[PDB]
């Protein structure tokens, strides 16, 4: 016999690819104001007898999520109010160990011929002293940056967004459950979009993410490398209740012709420290399980949890975006115990929390955002779905392993949510031999 070249179009094959993914989804939220809906339901195709390599540490979907959150954040923040006219000397004393101060200042009015002394309430962590007189203060970042106040109409609710492939492309999902982050996945499926992922800003604890199916799964590119992040994904969440129990007034002043600036106004009632209430039994059971799994990656050593010796405050303390407010909670108490191989299993754990209004997510050089004051009282609650941990080096031959909260790199949180996905391109055209010319 003889064979001829035959051409088939619509061949079910693919190659690795990077393409641009777009949004879809199920208040003026910075992430959802100009997007499209998802299909009523995603479809799933099980790719029987298909095995493919995944790598969570080299996933370009993570890099796109990073680029998008920065661009979306900036688009929303840009058309707001410049606070430069307010970079004048503040004069105050405190109103909780001096945490809140009521400061007067000299600011030019919309009338160019007039100046108005005015007042604003600030948190201590946003201002610094001037020329050692114990009364004069400056906004902490004004020396090098432009501080912009976010428009009060913008919501920061982290509404989950699905990432969808363009025509000609597909997203493959890994369904192994206990997948270790790389190498082959032997049970995979084809989808059009990812599940919705919430763009939650966080540092040490992973809040409002997905849970593991069977066990706590601990992933690291190399457990031996003490410089890398260890990502712990829990199969059960831990409940955290956060409150800022201070009945506030929203006050506004103008800082130019249509430029409104919002400050904390008169406080109703007394001043109290913000707190986050974590169930103790749940945290204790969670740590026991984490340790059992960490022990499996090392030579069955005792595990102790400690606090960081340094890093920016945004790194050292656990921070999160609450009801539009920014919390910095003292997590030391959550990582202050030694767990043993022969150890097995009631009240509350309370974290004092500090509040800051001037923040700089993603370290934009020369820029900072000023959070608006929020009146009334704030309550929010979250689910703790994971942890970003690191490992203390220098412990070879010490007989114990020492772990500390790590994190601070937002991409490590996105590596968890995008963990199961890979992007491929469809290559529908190909050839094979046939019997006929």
């Amino acid at each position, epitope marked *: 016999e003889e064979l001829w070249v035959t051409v088939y179009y619509g061949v079910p094959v693919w190659k690795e690819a990077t393409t641009t993914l777009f949004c879809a989804s199920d208040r003026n939220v910075w992430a959802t104001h100009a997007c499209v809906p998802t299909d009523p339901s995603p479809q799933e195709v099980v790719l029987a007898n298909v095995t493919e390599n995944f790598n969570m*540490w*080299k996933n370009n979907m993570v890099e796109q999520m990073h680029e998008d959150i920065i661009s979306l954040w900036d688009q929303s923040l840009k058309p707001c109010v410049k606070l430069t006219p307010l970079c004048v000397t503040l004069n105050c004393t405190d109103l909780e160990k001096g945490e809140i101060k009521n400061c007067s200042f000299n600011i030019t009015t919309s009338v160019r011929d007039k100046m108005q002394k005015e007042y604003a309430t600030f948190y201590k962590l946003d201002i610094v002293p001037i020329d050692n007189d114990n009364n004069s203060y400056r906004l902490i970042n004004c020396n*090098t940056s432009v501080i912009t106040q976010a428009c009060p109409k913008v919501s920061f609710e982290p509404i989950p967004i699905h990432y969808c492939a363009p025509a000609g492309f597909a997203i493959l999902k890994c369904n192994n459950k206990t997948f270790n982050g790389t190498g082959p996945c032997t049970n995979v499926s084809t989808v059009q979009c990812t599940h919705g992922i919430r763009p939650v800003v966080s540092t040490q604890l992973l809040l409002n993410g997905s849970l593991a199916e069977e066990e706590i799964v601990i992933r690291s*590119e*190399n457990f*031996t*490398d*003490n*410089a*890398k992040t260890i990502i712990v994904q829990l199969n059960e969440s831990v409940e955290i209740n956060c409150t800022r129990p201070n009945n506030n007034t929203r006050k506004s002043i103008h800082i130019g012709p249509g430029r409104w600036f919002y400050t904390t106004g008169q406080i109703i009632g007394n001043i109290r420290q913000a707190h986050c209430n974590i169930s103790r039994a749940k945290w204790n059971n969670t740590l026991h399980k984490i340790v059992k799994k960490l022990r499996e990656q090392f030579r069955n050593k005792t595990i102790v949890f400690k606090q*960081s*010796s*340094g*890093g*920016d405050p945004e*790194i050292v303390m656990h921070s999160f975006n609450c009801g539009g407010e920014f919390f910095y909670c003292n997590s030391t108490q959550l990582f202050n115990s030694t767990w043993y191989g022969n150890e097995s299993s009631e009240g509350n754990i309370t974290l004092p929390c500090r509040i800051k209004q001037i923040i700089n997510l993603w*370290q934009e*050089v020369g820029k900072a955002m000023y959070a608006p004051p929020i009146g009334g009282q704030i309550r929010c609650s979250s689910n703790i779905t994971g942890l970003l941990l*690191t490992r*203390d*080096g*220098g*412990n*070879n*031959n*010490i007989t114990t392993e020492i772990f500390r909260p*790590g*994190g*601070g*790199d937002m991409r490590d949180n996105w590596r968890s949510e995008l963990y199961k996905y890979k992007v491929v391109k469809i290559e529908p055209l190909g050839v094979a031999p046939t019997k006929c010319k």
Partner: antibody
Amino acid sequence: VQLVQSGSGVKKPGASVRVSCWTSEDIFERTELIHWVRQAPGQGLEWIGWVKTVTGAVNFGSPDFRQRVSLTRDRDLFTAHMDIRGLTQGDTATYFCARQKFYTGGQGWYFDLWGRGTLIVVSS
Amino acid sequence: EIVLTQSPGTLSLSPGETASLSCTAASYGHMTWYQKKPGQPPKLLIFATSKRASGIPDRFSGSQFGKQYTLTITRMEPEDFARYYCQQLEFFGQGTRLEI
């Protein structure tokens, strides 16, 4: 550009010393991890610790450095710092600042650049 | 107890010979090498995966057999009679000297 290294002073026991190193914007912002090492005369090379250029997170090669040495970094001024407290004669050594740009994961730890180095002397 | 063991410590080779320097890796893993001259900072010679470091004109090479990584010096070029060190992530070896 080779890392610019300052210091090389002499201290009495119990004293503190601050050592820093500098690079250009283009090198600093392409570097993920800055490491510090120690080379006491005749002793070989000992790792001290590291500072992550993104978060300021730190680690150490020993619990004793963790207790006495404060490590940090500066984003606007492209520098890094090693603040050593409680100096003793046993700390006399040449110290070096070095960079790892190798965001290569499991490949391992590499030093693309070592700076000139500084000699810290502790004596009575 | 000992993470990285340096061998042989001291070698003596005339120019034109090939050096063979090596270290044993506790718990395996990758291993890299650096070259030092007195009064100078060290420089990277080879990656822990045996890729040559940029700047090296094909004088150094190596590979790993189980736990032992071996680095060699082609024809003992005189410029390379340096002290050499092994590195395995956070640990460094003791160092090897070259004489004539």
